[PDB]
RNA sequence: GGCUCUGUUGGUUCUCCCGCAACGCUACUCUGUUUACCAGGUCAGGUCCGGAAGGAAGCAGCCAAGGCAGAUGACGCGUGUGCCGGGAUGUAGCUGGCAGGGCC
RNA sequence: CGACGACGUUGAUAGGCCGGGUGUGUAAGCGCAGCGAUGCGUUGAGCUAACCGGUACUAAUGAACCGUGAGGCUUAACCU
């Protein structure tokens, strides 16, 4: 729907100009409504729209085929850039034990996240993990975390509803430091931003254990309240990251964009399922790619774009390799054009001042020499041509054995090619008239031939 | 006795220094990356960057002021129409210093020094 | 007015076997490019033998092929789905019905 | 100079950046007054090195290298 709406909008409003702010109105409105149906926070929607405007002012769109497609490309790039980077991971470098604190609303899946991160850090990172339940409120929450910990093979710290979260996490931290645990996972009760006592509680806990990692667990189906929750939780605690859960649903998941924008904290994890063994890393491009459904439209476009890309790549590379300078390719061309057009008898006539000093019969026969040169060049691979400085003795052996001649002749032609390269380089650096007039006839004295 | 003393002499008299940093600053701003000795370039930090902090607030006063720092109109107009917007959201640290091999002639330690966004705005253009 | 446990029976879980239907996984190969002479084929050009007829060693290019990647079918390893599927087995564990006692 | 002291991202070691302090002494622009120099208002203004308090924005790199693997003989005094 996005591509269709944008293409339709850019087509119906303006013809082919260079896109201007006046043409992006209905575009921005349709994108706005698209994000509103995506359950994205309205202020985030507006602040994104502003960036879309800033990118719309300078559009290079006119030179392409489909304006809506490249506009979609720009929006996707900006959105991915807004989602942050990849390979985001908790800091297990930390001085052990590493303390990870959980925060979020009720039924956010914080406990299941503790189980997932438990199995993940235990198996993959080879870490010794201790888990503890700070929840004295929710019935059988401690038993749940204990069960999950028993399933993932992670040691569990005993706790009950008769205790207090502070003493619980303090005893857990003490036990973690005493038994030399690598990672301390702290699960806490789901709480509302409108609750003062619970916020003071999680603040006292965060102050008590001083966690190196504070994770914010929010549902993917969360609505406009995600703004309030993200803001309040961000102002209450110095979040080190955000953990999104229930991404496997059909939900739009604009709440991720909301929290990411408002808090400014990166998303390090995406729950892909209910089970403990199911966890996925956060990929900005994957999340920013899909809120939609469609078919058969994007395939042809992606194909054509690929064709244009590979064509422009090959055509630019072909000019780039030939634009490096003078090589054995151009030398080969000049040599075949030589042997075809060879003017030795005529060039002896064309030259006047050089014939008065040098011998008249000193001119070598073009046919034999240039056939030898052509054939010897034909014994060379394309790499030794474009890059002549990689030629060594063994390659000279291959060449000489291939053409059925002596290596000294190969060295001779490499010398002549060196001379030609130097000369043509001097022609490229200076003027052809300054360089043609700079040509000098060397005489070692005023005596002829001495 | 050098105690708590800041600034580096670099074997020049006062005015000479001052000038050298004006042209070095100018040159950097113009090309966005240069190659100089290490210590000259650690002293350049303390010149160029406050210029940038100046350009992050636009007024006639600051235009003039930075002109009196660098003595060039090309450099100031660039400073305010480009680098002012660019670093607008960043706190200090506008330059990065990368040490390299040694000046072959005298065996001096060399460093490229550059604006942090030298790369991405040279790519995106 | 509730509950527990025996007699009988219906389910369910675990262990073993199997059918139908409904969701998900490696190693090889097809394309993208790569590897100078020292694996191979065609081997232009040139070169070797011959008056000629023609053969020959073999460079480059190309194709296997050998590196590195984008995914194609069958093997290999799994399952909170449905037919309350069909069976085997527990001296088992859990649950319900009925014949009920007894405890309050 | 070697040397000693602090630190090297789990980081305030250095510069920057934010705040203060200090110093100088009321920036520039604009408005008003005057024929003009200059004055008056915006204004204790503007700038401020080396100082103090914060802040990882830039640089302090994953590594590698040196260093090893139970430590001589004799005698005595306890211990098997
Ligand atoms: N599909 C899916 N379900 C999830 C995920 N995380 C949690 N849940 C569900 O959340 C339910 C219990 O949430 P819970 O962890 O107890 O809430 P919390 O302890 O307050 O964070 C479980 O039944 C899970 O099925 C997830 O990433 N994906
Ligand atoms: F349901 Al919760 F913390 F486990 F709110
Ligand atoms: Mg919980």
Swiss-Prot record, chain A:
E.C. designation(s): 3.6.5.4
GO molecular function: 7S RNA binding; ATP hydrolysis activity; GTP binding; GTPase activity
Keywords assigned: Cytoplasm, GTP-binding, Hydrolase, Nucleotide-binding, Ribonucleoprotein, RNA-binding, Signal recognition particle
Reactions it catalyzes: GTP + H2O = GDP + phosphate + H(+)
Main location: cytoplasm
A cellular component term, taken from the record's GO annotations: ribonucleoprotein complex
Binding site for GTP: 104-111, 187-191, 245-248
UniProt activity-regulation remark: Conformation of the Ffh-FtsY complex and regulation of its GTPase activity are modulated by the 4.5S RNA. Formation of the FfH-FtsY complex leads to a mutual stimulation of both GTPases.
Cell location: Cytoplasm
Enzyme class: hydrolase
GO term, biological process aspect, one: protein targeting to membrane
Disulfide bonds: none
Phenotype when the gene is knocked out: Essential; deletion experiments lead to loss of inner membrane protein targeting. Also leads to reduced targeting of lipoproteins Lpp and BRP.
Domain of life: Bacteria
Record note on quaternary structure: Part of the signal recognition particle protein translocation system, which is composed of SRP and FtsY. SRP is a ribonucleoprotein composed of Ffh and a 4.5S RNA molecule. Metal ions are essential for the formation and stability of the SRP complex. Interacts with the ribosomes, via ribosomal protein L23. Interacts with FtsY.
Job of this protein: Involved in targeting and insertion of nascent membrane proteins into the cytoplasmic membrane. Binds to the hydrophobic signal sequence of the ribosome-nascent chain (RNC) as it emerges from the ribosomes. The SRP-RNC complex is then targeted to the cytoplasmic membrane where it interacts with the SRP receptor FtsY. Interaction with FtsY leads to the transfer of the RNC complex to the Sec translocase for insertion into the membrane, the hydrolysis of GTP by both Ffh and FtsY, and the dissociation of the SRP-FtsY complex into the individual components.
PANTHER family from the UniProt entry: SIGNAL RECOGNITION PARTICLE 54K PROTEIN SRP54 (PTHR11564), SIGNAL RECOGNITION PARTICLE SUBUNIT SRP54 (PTHR11564:SF5)
Listed NCBIfam families: ffh
Protein name listed in UniProt: Signal recognition particle protein
Upper lineage: Bacteria, Pseudomonadati, Pseudomonadota, Gammaproteobacteria, Enterobacterales
Curated annotation (Swiss-Prot), chain B:
Source organism of the structure: Escherichia coli (strain K12)
InterPro entries named among the record's database cross-references: Ribosomal_bL17, Ribosomal_bL17_CS, Ribosomal_bL17_sf
Top-level taxon: Bacteria
GO cellular component: cytoplasm; cytosol; cytosolic large ribosomal subunit
Keywords noted in UniProt: Ribonucleoprotein, Ribosomal protein
Family per record: Belongs to the bacterial ribosomal protein bL17 family.
Protein name per its UniProtKB record: Large ribosomal subunit protein bL17
Keyword Ribosomal protein: yes
């Amino acid at each position: 729907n996005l591509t269709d709406r944008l293409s339709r909008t850019l087509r119906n409003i303006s013809g082919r100009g260079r896109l201007t702010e006046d043409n992006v109105k209905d575009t921005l409105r349709e994108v706005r409504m698209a994000l509103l149906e995506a359950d994205v926070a309205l202020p985030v929607v507006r602040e994104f729209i502003n960036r879309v405007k800033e990118k719309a002012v300078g559009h290079e769109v006119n030179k392409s085929l489909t304006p809506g497609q490249e506009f979609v490309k720009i929006v996707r790039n900006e959105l991915v850039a807004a989602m942050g980077e990849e390979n985001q991971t908790l800091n297990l470098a930390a001085q052990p034990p590493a303390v990870v604190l959980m925060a979020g609303l009720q039924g956010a899946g914080k406990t299941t996240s503790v189980g997932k991160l438990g199995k993940f850090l235990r198996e993959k990172h080879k870490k010794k993990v201790l888990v503890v339940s700070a929840d004295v409120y929710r019935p059988a929450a401690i038993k749940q975390l204990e069960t999950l910990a028993e399933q993932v093979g992670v040691d569990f710290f005993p706790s009950d509803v008769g205790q207090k979260p502070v003493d619980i996490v303090n005893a857990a931290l003490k036990e973690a430091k005493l038994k030399f645990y690598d990672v301390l996972l702290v699960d806490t009760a789901g709480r509302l931003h409108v609750d003062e006592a619970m916020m003071d509680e999680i603040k006292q806990v965060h102050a008590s254990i001083n966690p190196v990692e504070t994770l914010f667990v929010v549902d993917a189906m969360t609505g406009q309240d995600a703004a309030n929750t993200a803001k309040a939780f961000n102002e209450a605690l110095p979040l080190t990251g955000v953990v999104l859960t229930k991404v496997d649903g059909d939900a739009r998941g604009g709440a991720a964009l909301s929290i990411r924008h408002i808090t400014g904290k990166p998303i390090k994890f995406l729950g892909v399922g209910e089970k403990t063994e199911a966890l996925e890393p956060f990929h900005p491009d994957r999340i920013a790619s899909r809120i939609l459904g469609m078919g058969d439209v994007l395939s042809l476009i992606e194909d054509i774009e690929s064709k244009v890309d590979r064509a422009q790549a090959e055509k630019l590379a072909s000019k780039l390799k030939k634009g490096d300078g003078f090589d054995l390719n151009d030398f080969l061309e000049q040599l075949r054009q030589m042997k075809n057009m060879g003017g030795x008898x005529x060039x002896x006539x064309x030259x006047x001042x050089x014939x008065x000093x040098x011998x008249x019969x000193x001119x070598x026969x073009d046919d034999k020499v240039l056939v030898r040169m052509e054939a010897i060049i034909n014994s060379m691979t394309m790499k030794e041509r474009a890059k002549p400085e990689i030629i060594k003795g063994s390659r000279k052996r291959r060449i000489a054995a291939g053409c059925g001649m002596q290596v000294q002749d190969v060295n001779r032609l490499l010398k002549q090619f060196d001379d030609m390269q130097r000369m043509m380089k001097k022609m490229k650096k200076g003027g052809x008239x300054x360089x043609x007039x700079x040509x000098x006839x060397x005489x070692x004295x005023x005596x002829x031939x001495x | 006795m050098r105690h708590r003393k800041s600034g580096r002499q670099l074997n020049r008299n006062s005015s000479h220094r001052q000038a050298m940093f004006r042209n070095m600053a100018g040159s950097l701003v113009r090309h966005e990356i240069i190659k100089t000795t290490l210590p000259k370039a650690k002293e350049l930090r303390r010149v160029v960057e406050p210029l940038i902090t100046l350009a992050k607030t636009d007024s006639v006063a600051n235009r003039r002021l930075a002109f009196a720092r660098t003595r060039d109109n090309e450099i100031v107009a660039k400073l305010f129409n480009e680098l002012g917007p660019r670093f607008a959201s960043r706190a200090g640290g506008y330059t990065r210093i990368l040490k390299c091999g040694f000046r072959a002639g005298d065996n001096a330690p060399m460093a490229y020094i550059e604006l942090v966004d030298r790369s991405e705005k040279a790519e995106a253009a």
